[model samples]
Target: EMLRKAVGKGAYEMAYSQQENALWLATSQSRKLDKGGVVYRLDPVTLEVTQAIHNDLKPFGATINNTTQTLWFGNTVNSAVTAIDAKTGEVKGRLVLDDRKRTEEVRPLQPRELVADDATNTVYISGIGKESVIWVVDGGNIKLKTAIQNTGKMSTGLALDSEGKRLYTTNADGELITIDTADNKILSRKKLLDDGKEHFFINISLDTARQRAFITDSKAAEVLVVDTRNGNILAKVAAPESLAVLFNPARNEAYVTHRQAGKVSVIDAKSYKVVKTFDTPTHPNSLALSADGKTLYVSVKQKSTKQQEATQPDDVIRIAL
Candidate 1:
């Protein structure tokens, strides 16, 4: 009953389904992006792969709504967003935006992150490398609604307040943009910090009740506690090369991944202090919390080089608090 770890090749971002008693891992190669991708369903306690979904587009970014039993993930390698029903392991919907042909970009204008409104399963998509807009895709029927234009440079992360109808996004320029999803109107855009240095805001997590956003910057060595209301930097907590951030309301704490420093830092939500750290071998990618809010599941990737790229299996862990 103490199965806490496992290793695999195609584990990247994750979505945990409480209703189905499953943890879904979006699989893709870190180096060449071939061999096709798979969405894996694992038993939460045992970390055993019970099911799988295969596709070439590659599902990477993910968020789940247990209420609706829908899982939304971005096909980042290609230009698509897919919605699947976790309860039945079925393809519910897929929206293909064709970012590759949309522009002749040298780096590829593809979907990077996604946020789905749980009430209606409407997902907001963000693209990498100057796409500069959020694509609204209908989750129920799989169709394009519209794009909120002129967001910023390479909008990296997205989180939604489904109850409040507000969508929040961050870009590489260290800026936050608030949009009213009701009318698809841009409410405000503000720079988080202007320290005369470089910043690349990689991920954002929200404390909806407190109107706070916990963001990780790949360029800066700290986690920014931001005000989602006005894009204000409330506090800067010290962390080394923070990448993915998850705010756990049940524990009243935030978990951050330090990819370069090879660990995961746990910060107290109220104190803004580093309470603990878990040493990871290489890169820890996405995090998933269980239904009772007592367990945390993490996906740790293996180090990649020119010679050993995508050869090693990633480590998955179950940490019970």
Candidate 2:
């Protein structure tokens, strides 16, 4: 199959757009390269590459605004946040966040995660720099609304509830933060790992109807289920280098991607038990489900070759429910 072959380098994150009925992928260059990141659109059913956009920088995070028919991505090597036409694959707008606080020695506005609230026409961009902040942008105008400060360093992953009332994010400091979207204020903060062991909370997915959240601990190789009402960790399910998670309400299940194991573990939402395990490509980092929740599209990082230090081209694999 075409998906079994190497497609491109460094497939990092992915988001699904119902408006376009396509899966959007963020690809990065090897660590040895200065600047080469791209965004691709694929047919979810066939796992075929439909379109590609040259991002011109390393795009680490991506989200789609269905109401606006726009795709937004964050650049890791620069401070620019770009918006592209979801249907036409055309660059619509770019907004460069303020980097005056960053010195020549420090990196500026390294955005690693994105979440959009279509109800308010706003997109949230999380900065993974020393000065942790979330830049709220007006989706209609593509302009800055305000910046929420002190989220925690390396705020990489984000999730929103069904109503878009509250926002949740994970930081490298082993903390889970809840934000009030209406006022842009910090609602609560809880530490995931406090036993002196380092744990990196990478990504999160929410099941609002059950008031539960699933988060991936990449360093500890665990998937944690937390009660949204009290921030209490209800269950800890062992996984292999888990990196991204998604919740399906129709099936009452959660799908977690293991980066090193190259597999996806399906967990029952009620019992928090591993119900199934499906094989994928190497380094399955992020995934997105189709609008109908019948197919899952995964972005996989290709295994690195011995001849070169950098990894080979990555691929997007499709799985049917």
Best by TM-score, which number? 1
The all-Cα superposition gives candidate 2 an RMSD in Å to the true structure of 2.6
RMSD to the true structure for each prediction, in A, is 2.2, 2.6
**How close is every model to the real structure, measured as TM-score?**
0.93, 0.90
Number of colliding residue pairs in model 2? 2
**How many clashes in candidate 1?**
0
Off by over 4 Å in 2: 1-6, 29-36, 98-104, 162-164, 305-312
Question: Model 2, 39-147: lDDT tens per residue?
Answer: 8887767766788888766776788888887888887667768888888999887888765556688667677778889898899988777658888999888899999
lDDT of 1 by residue, 212-319 (tens): 999988887889998877777788999888988989989889999887777888999999989999877677888878887788878887777667676767878788
lDDT of 2 at 308: 71
Candidate 1's C-alpha lDDT? 0.81
